[PDB]
Amino acid sequence: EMKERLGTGGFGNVIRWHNQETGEQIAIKQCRQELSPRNRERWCLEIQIMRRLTHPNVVAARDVPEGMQNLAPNDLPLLAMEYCQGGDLRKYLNQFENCCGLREGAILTLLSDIASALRYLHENRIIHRDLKPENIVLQQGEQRLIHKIIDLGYAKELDQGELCTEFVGTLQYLAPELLEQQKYTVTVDYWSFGTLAFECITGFRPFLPNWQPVQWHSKVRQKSEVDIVVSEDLNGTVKFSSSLPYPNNLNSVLAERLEKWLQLMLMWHPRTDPTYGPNGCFKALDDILNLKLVHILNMVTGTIHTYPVTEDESLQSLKARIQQDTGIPEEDQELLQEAGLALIPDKPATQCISDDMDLVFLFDNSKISPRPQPESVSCILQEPKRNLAFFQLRKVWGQVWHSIQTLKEDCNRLQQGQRAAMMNLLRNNSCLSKMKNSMASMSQQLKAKLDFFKTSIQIDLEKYSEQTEFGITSDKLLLAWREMEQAVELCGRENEVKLLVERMMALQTDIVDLQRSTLDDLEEQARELYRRLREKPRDQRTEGDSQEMVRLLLQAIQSFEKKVRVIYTQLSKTVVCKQKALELLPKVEEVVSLMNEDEKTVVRLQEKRQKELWNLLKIACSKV
Amino acid sequence: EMKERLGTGGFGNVIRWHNQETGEQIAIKQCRQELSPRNRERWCLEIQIMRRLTHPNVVAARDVPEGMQNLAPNDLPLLAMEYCQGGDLRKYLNQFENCCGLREGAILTLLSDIASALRYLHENRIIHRDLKPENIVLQQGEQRLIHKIIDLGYAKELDQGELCTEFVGTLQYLAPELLEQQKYTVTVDYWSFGTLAFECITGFRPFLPNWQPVQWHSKVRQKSEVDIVVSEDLNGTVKFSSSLPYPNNLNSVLAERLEKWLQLMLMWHPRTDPTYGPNGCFKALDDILNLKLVHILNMVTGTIHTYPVTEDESLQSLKARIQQDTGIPEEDQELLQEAGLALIPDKPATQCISDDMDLVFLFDNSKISPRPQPESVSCILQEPKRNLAFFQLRKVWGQVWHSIQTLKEDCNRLQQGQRAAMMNLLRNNSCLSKMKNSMASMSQQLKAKLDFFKTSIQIDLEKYSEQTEFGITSDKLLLAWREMEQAVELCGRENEVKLLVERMMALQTDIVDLQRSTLDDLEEQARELYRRLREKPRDQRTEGDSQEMVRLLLQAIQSFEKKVRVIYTQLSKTVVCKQKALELLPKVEEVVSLMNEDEKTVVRLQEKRQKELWNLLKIACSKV
Numbered sequence A, B: 001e002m003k004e005r006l007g008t009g010g011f012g013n014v015i016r017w018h019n020q021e022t023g024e025q026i027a028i029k030q031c032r033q034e035l036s037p038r039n040r041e042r043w044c045l046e047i048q049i050m051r052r053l054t055h056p057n058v059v060a061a062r063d064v065p066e067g068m069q070n071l072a073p074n075d076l077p078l079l080a081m082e083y084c085q086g087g088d089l090r091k092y093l094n095q096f097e098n099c100c101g102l103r104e105g106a107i108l109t110l111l112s113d114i115a116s117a118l119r120y121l122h123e124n125r126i127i128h129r130d131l132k133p134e135n136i137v138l139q140q141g142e143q144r145l146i147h148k149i150i151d152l153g154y155a156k157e158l159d160q161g162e163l164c165t166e167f168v169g170t171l172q173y174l175a176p177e178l179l180e181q182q183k184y185t186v187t188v189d190y191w192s193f194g195t196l197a198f199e200c201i202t203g204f205r206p207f208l209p210n211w212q213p214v215q216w217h218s219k220v221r222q223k224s225e226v227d228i229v230v231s232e233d234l235n236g237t238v239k240f241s242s243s244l245p246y247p248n249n250l251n252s253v254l255a256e257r258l259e260k261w262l263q264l265m266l267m268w269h270p271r272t273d274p275t276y277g278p279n280g281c282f283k284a285l286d287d288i289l290n291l292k293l294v295h296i297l298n299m300v301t302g303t304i305h306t307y308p309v310t311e312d313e314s315l316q317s318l319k320a321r322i323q324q325d326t327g328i329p330e331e332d333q334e335l336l337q338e339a340g341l342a343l344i345p346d347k348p349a350t351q352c353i354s355d356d357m358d359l360v361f362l363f364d365n366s367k368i369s370p371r372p373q374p375e376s377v378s379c380i381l382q383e384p385k386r387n388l389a390f391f392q393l394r395k396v397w398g399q400v401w402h403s404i405q406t407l408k409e410d411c412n413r414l415q416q417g418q419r420a421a422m423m424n425l426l427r428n429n430s431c432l433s434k435m436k437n438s439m440a441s442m443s444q445q446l447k448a449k450l451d452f453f454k455t456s457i458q459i460d461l462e463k464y465s466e467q468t469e470f471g472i473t474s475d476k477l478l479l480a481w482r483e484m485e486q487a488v489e490l491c492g493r494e495n496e497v498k499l500l501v502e503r504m505m506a507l508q509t510d511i512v513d514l515q516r517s518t519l520d521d522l523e524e525q526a527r528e529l530y531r532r533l534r535e536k537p538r539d540q541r542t543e544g545d546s547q548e549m550v551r552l553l554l555q556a557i558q559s560f561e562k563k564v565r566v567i568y569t570q571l572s573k574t575v576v577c578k579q580k581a582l583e584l585l586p587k588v589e590e591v592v593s594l595m596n597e598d599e600k601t602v603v604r605l606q607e608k609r610q611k612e613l614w615n616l617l618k619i620a621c622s623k624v
Helices: A037-050 A089-093 A106-122 A187-201 A252-264 A281-289 A315-325 A398-430 A434-450 A496-512 A519-533 A547-582 A587-591 A595-604 A606-610 A613-619 B037-050 B089-093 B106-123 B187-201 B252-264 B280-289 B315-325 B398-430 B434-450 B496-512 B519-533 B547-582 B586-593 B595-604 B606-610 B613-619
Strands: A012-018 A025-031 A079-082 A293-298 A306-308 A333-335 A359-363 B012-018 B025-031 B079-082 B136-140 B145-149 B293-298 B306-308 B333-335 B359-363
Touching (some): A037 A079, A106 A187, A106 A281, A187 A252, A187 A281, A252 A281, A252 A306, A293 A315, A293 A398, A306 A315, A315 A333, A359 A398, A398 A496, A398 A519, A398 A547, A434 A595, A434 B434, A496 A547, A496 A587, A595 A606, A613 B613, B012 B079, B037 B079, B106 B145, B106 B187, B252 B306, B293 B315, B293 B398, B306 B315, B315 B333, B359 B398, B398 B434, B398 B519, B434 B586, B434 B595, B496 B547, B586 B595, B595 B606
Parallel strands (some): B293 B359
Antiparallel strands (some): A012 A025, A293 A306, B012 B025, B025 B079, B136 B145
């Protein structure tokens, strides 16, 4: 057996063991080298802790190998535990595509997981203190992944003592008040968990670069109360803000939302959700996580627009909410779902999620071709310069293709906009139109039937013509009995509707004749530079430049405004057809209706032209 | 005016003259150089002959240029004659396409022409003797071409001695018995004409190829009783075949037909077979040429199937004949003519050759795709070993692309099969179907009319309900006046023809749901090699290989069986629709017909229910 180490370091040394046969992957943590009696007595505590209270997101202690117990460099016990393959969070964070601070809801997994983990220990009288991504493995699971935690050498039992007294590795984390200061409560973890997530989101903690033991404890401790971001734009201009940075698209609402949490759950004793005042972690992050939010795309222009709904927010409520932001009355509000299908009114807003997807929305008009893309600092604060950095461009360059991949990403959003927009036109057409249209063809049948009337009454008209002698001596109600034949014959409108359908039939197919008809390249091309820089040797912290990278981001926009114009050109054209049908659906609605009136009720009540014989046959009988 | 030479050589030298103006193209034949008195006296004969007895297929002597009767220091006359532009048969036979022998009926032209030419001279007491394709021009004409003959300086008046004894020329042709042997009759031409056609067909000019005129008379006269082809397969193993080469590609029956003629009309004195006529030439070839034959394509599989008909072979006769060969009873015999149109039964045999142009035939079933396929020897006798042909590959390689061009050619035959097959479906559809179909729409009119009955009788039914009026005088013709309402109401297919169209509408789209119909490239790609070899510098046409050419012919079939399967896949599918309509037609043919009877004529003669008032208005008047 023996291989690597799950989360090596800590107090001793964890090693992956493979019990010859079976197939089980175990992990034992043998002490580095027997130290003082207090340290050994301390370790016996650590192993004692693992043995009890365990749950996911936190490795579960296993039982020492049946006989592999003997083999012990130290006559001291051995800490056995499960083996979690895959993980080493850093390996993830260090990914080249996750650079610049990720940019997906995958941060929720980390939060919801590491939360259920800390919450567990805390309520069990334990403090990990050292919560660095180096001991957070992403073991596989059912669907997504499980954020399990390894080695707990660095621990604090709220009923006796501690364990790890040194610092095996970096300490970029670990709450300040824990930095060899006086006592420390459970709040020490809240800080680690904060900066840890602060990195999973943004892509690095506040003042992360500038050493740690240096003026760090002097600067980071200085000002910036209830703040967060503390880096340095442009040159060495040391600054500190109080809001999640820019290079990261976690979510419109979520951003400015948990921003306050990662701002709160980031300190000493007072941090501890404000809503109550005691502790953050627990309830704090919980409410945010399991919150139901939807996504609306203002196809009018200003893309994106997330709205946090309830477990049953009536759709009627939402339509009004959106109108409040990006105008557009509840009337001309067309909401399609990346498939053209229109939403359901009877069903509550809660439906445009169901365990990325959103709800592409549009309005009524005939189209403008903008695409406002705010450019975060750092890079925008580099356009005037082009003076080239020395190495910082490792991230600077980074947040560029991530800015281009944002244009490619954002383009596909408005693309999914018309893709869903015109999709709707095909529905209210080949259905509640093409069908109605083709059915109105029965008109040729209705007018044709009317002609039989000139063979059942007209042919029967010649019966009173040659019946003659004693009865037509009046000719009273017989006058217009022939003047009405030259009347009903001069009124049909059957051919008329025929010229419309034959010409309209062209549009019916003209529209379906569509569903047919680089920035994508630039995004990939640019990526080549980072993959070549972050992988390049370690002797190039000089040279410095960005002239090429900038020339790419430039061509990205030069090609973005290009595709955008085309998309809105194809969209504005599909709207012309939607209006050319939505208004010309009634043009064939009235014409077909003018038949069940000008024809039906007209020639139907015309039974008098066949009833005026109902008196002639009794008025000419009451004679003699 | 001096130019080239029609058929230069012979006795003197023919030259193309262009009388300055006018535009006429004349041809004069000035003697090489005044020879002995006998030769000159001989030449004066040749020029004397041309001046008389002339007809097409044989240059006609013209009158010496009105002016310039000089440009030659000879006490001897000048032979003037017409100029036939284009021709030099060899130029044709030497075509890279006509290689491997003329694989088309274009051989008939040559035969029927050169025949009418020789037959002419022979009956006029002349023998050309030297009938090499070098003096046979293909002058243009009305439709096809005229195989005219030039220079006769080697002819022989059967009355005024020979013309000019002299070997010269490749000599190859010219009957053996004429090869400086003793006397010679008119049979000497029969041989020339034979080998001449033997070349136009096979392309090899069989009966010993390039063999030396000396080591010929020995290996030629050898056995080969009534034989023809004489070459050497693989190595140098010479053979004597009695049936022309398989790669003739001219016609199924014609091949093995005139094969015996070209076998007969190919020898010396006795052979030339009055076995049915005067001699070969005359009657022989005549009967063959003027024979009427048809072409049937057994779409079942075994393509091709020509049948020699008479001047009036009743079609009933042929159908039985074909059944005898490729089974398929006279019942399930569908014969279409590259247009889907079915043949005419009352019309005889000629019905097919409306003077390629064949008669694509099929049978009844539902498919799976096999197919017969020869390959001829030589090449097939080379697959077991395709390495180092020293030179022979000049023709071997040849009859390969001619084999691939045969696959490309054959493919387009079956392609013209479905191209004509489905062509027929479109006819018996958008016509004797789509028309019948749309007309059955009147059903909605017929059932709709029936509703008037519940306004002319149902509204008149409420008259006897509150009867306080005068709508009866004897209840005589009033009895069935209500029994007919429950009658006309129980006859109105509003659901019959409707169920057919709705279901049929599926087939209407089921057929159009098709329309999805390499080798073309291969044929051309291969050609590149011949064009590169037959043109390869006079010192590199040797070498030895074929490994590449074979790899091509292989990919040809590998791609042939590919397209074939697809074609039969598209065909077998169209047959499914034809049967899905042919059987689902009459069922909608009668139902729609039961309307123009149960509805039209029924409710139309129902004018009596509107005419019984024609007497009530005169029977109640003859009382006053």
